[PDB]
């Protein structure tokens, strides 16, 4: 099943391809091969986000 | 303040 994380902090994209989100958002983790920047999806957008802004759900 | 953006690889 898909892995989900939940946002601990609001994140405003600064570069192309980054995924924005607000606290409480559930993000589907699509790629966690890098220890710092993961690829995720939320509400129909996908993009890279900082792992230190989220916490594990499942 | 929110945490610093980590290094891009």
Curated annotation (Swiss-Prot), chain A:
Sequence positions bearing Phosphothreonine: 55
Effect of substituting residue 50 to L: Abolishes interaction with SHB
Tell me which residues bear Phosphotyrosine. 53
Pinpoint the SH3 domain residues: 3-58
Q: Could you describe the post-translational modifications of this protein? A: Phosphorylation of Tyr-53 in the C-terminal SH3 domain reduces its binding to SOS1. Ubiquitinated by RNF173, leading to proteasomal degradation and inhibition of the RAF/MEK/ERK pathway.
Where it sits in the cell: the answer is: Nucleus; Cytoplasm; Endosome; Golgi apparatus
Quaternary data: Homodimer. Associates (via SH2 domain) with activated EGF and PDGF receptors (tyrosine phosphorylated). Interacts with PDGFRA (tyrosine phosphorylated); the interaction may be indirect. Also associates to other cellular Tyr-phosphorylated proteins such as SIT1, IRS1, IRS2, IRS4, SHC and LNK; probably via the concerted action of both its SH2 and SH3 domains. It also seems to interact with RAS in the signaling pathway leading to DNA synthesis. Interacts with SOS1. Forms a complex with MUC1 and SOS1, through interaction of the SH3 domains with SOS1 and the SH2 domain with phosphorylated MUC1.
Q: Which protein family is it in?
A: Belongs to the GRB2/sem-5/DRK family.
UniProt remark on domains? The SH3 domains mediate interaction with RALGPS1 and SHB.
**UniProt function note:** Non-enzymatic adapter protein that plays a pivotal role in precisely regulated signaling cascades from cell surface receptors to cellular responses, including signaling transduction and gene expression. Thus, participates in many biological processes including regulation of innate and adaptive immunity, autophagy, DNA repair or necroptosis. Controls signaling complexes at the T-cell antigen receptor to facilitate the activation, differentiation, and function of T-cells.
Write the protein's name.
Answer: Growth factor receptor-bound protein 2
User: What is the originating organism of this protein?
Assistant: Homo sapiens (Human)
The gene coding this protein? GRB2
Give the shown range, full length included.
Answer: 159 to 214 of 217
Swiss-Prot record, chain B:
Superkingdom classification of source: Eukaryota
- How is it modified post-translationally? Phosphorylated on tyrosine residue(s) by the thrombopoietin receptor (TPOR), stem cell factor receptor (SCFR), and T-cell and B-cell antigen receptors, gp130, IL-2R and IL-3R. Phosphorylated upon stimulation of TNFRSF11A/RANK by TNFSF11/RANKL. Phosphorylated upon EGF stimulation. Phosphorylated on tyrosine residues by HCK upon IL6 signaling. Dephosphorylated by PTPN11.
Question: Which compartment or compartments is the protein found in?
Answer: Cytoplasm; Cell membrane; Membrane raft
Motif range (SH3-binding): 2-9
User: Where does the chain cross the membrane?
Assistant: none
Q: What is known of its domains?
A: The SH3-binding motifs mediate interaction with SHC1 and GRB2. The PH domain mediates phosphatidylinositol 3,4,5-trisphosphate and phosphatidylinositol 3,4-bisphosphate binding.
Q: Which family does it belong to?
A: Belongs to the GAB family.
| Subunit text | Part of a complex composed of EEIG1, TNFRSF11A/RANK, PLCG2, GAB2, TEC and BTK; complex formation increases in the presence of TNFSF11/RANKL. Interacts with SHC1; may mediate interaction with receptors. Interacts with SYK. Interacts with PI-3 kinase. Interacts with GRB2 (via SH3 2 domain). Interacts (phosphorylated) with PTPN11. Interacts with TNFRSF11A (via cytoplasmic domain). Interacts (phosphorylated) with 14-3-3 family proteins SFN, YWHAB, YWHAE, YWHAG, YWHAH, YWHAQ and YWHAZ; prevents interaction with GRB2 and attenuates GAB2 signaling. Interacts with HCK.
Question: What does this protein do, in the record's words?
Answer: Adapter protein which acts downstream of several membrane receptors including cytokine, antigen, hormone, cell matrix and growth factor receptors to regulate multiple signaling pathways. Regulates osteoclast differentiation mediating the TNFRSF11A/RANK signaling. In allergic response, it plays a role in mast cells activation and degranulation through PI-3-kinase regulation. Also involved in the regulation of cell proliferation and hematopoiesis.
What is the protein's given name? GRB2-associated-binding protein 2
Q: What high-level taxonomic lineage is stated for the organism?
A: Eukaryota, Metazoa, Chordata, Craniata, Vertebrata
């Amino acid at each position: 099943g898909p892995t989900y994380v939940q946002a601990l902090f609001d994140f405003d994209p600064q570069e192309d391809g980054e995924l924005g989100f607000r606290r409480g958002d559930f993000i589907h983790v699509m790629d966690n091969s890098d220890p710092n920047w993961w690829k995720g999806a939320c509400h129909g957008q996908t993009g890279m986000f900082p792992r230190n802004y989220v916490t594990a759900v499942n | 303040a929110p945490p610093p953006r980590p290094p891009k690889p």
